[PDB]
Amino acid sequence: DVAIVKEGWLHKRGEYIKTWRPRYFLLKNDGTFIGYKERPQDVDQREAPLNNFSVAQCQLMKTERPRPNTFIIRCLQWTTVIERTFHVETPEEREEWTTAIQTVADGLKKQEEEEMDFR
């Protein structure tokens, strides 16, 4: 029952080269957040994504420097800290994305609690 919640272009900052590159991202309701260099094609041939990570259990932060309307997805995975940084042109667009991501994460957190509580 996995479905795309929101998709669109985002300016993503590199993990190694801290430069910014346009990436087409798709957020699914199972937590999947996948980004491509180009908008995906309809075939088993379609190139692999450049970014692929679950937003489950992650935290959303907003910042204005160095670029305004920046949002960061931070996940504490074991001993490794994952941080993915994105920028959009307007604060409205950022709210659009952060709300969508937070809703998906919250849904997954709800499922987690229902599995782990009072077992």
Residue 52: which residues within 8 A CB-CB, separation 6 or more?
32, 33, 34, 35
CA angle, corner 67, sides to 66 and 72, nearest 5? 95
What are phi and psi for residue 72, nearest 5 degrees? Answer: -120, 135
CB 72 within 8 A of CB 84: yes
84 is in an annotated binding site: yes
Burial class (CB in 10 A: 0-12, 13-18, 19+), 71: buried
* Amino acid occupying residue 107: G
Task: Name the strand (E) or helix (H) holding 97.
Answer: helix 91-116
Instruction: Check whether 119 is labelled as a binding-site residue.
Output: no
Tell me the structure's resolution in angstroms, rounded to a single decimal.
1.6
Q: Report domain extents, the chain.
A: 1-119
68 appears as a binding residue in the annotation: no
Check whether 17 is labelled as a binding-site residue: yes
Q: What fold is seen in the domain 1-119? A: PH-domain like (2.30.29)
DSSP code of residue 92:
H
CA distances, 26 to each of 17, 39, 73, 97 (Å): 23, 10, 14, 11
Q: Is 13 annotated as a binding residue?
A: yes
H-helix or E-strand spanning residue 113:
helix 91-116
Q: Which among 92, 118, 104 is positioned nearest to 5, based on CA atoms?
A: 104
DSSP letters, 38-75, are S---SSTT-PPPSEEEE-TT-EEEEE-SSSSSEEEEEE
Does 94 appear as a known binding residue? no
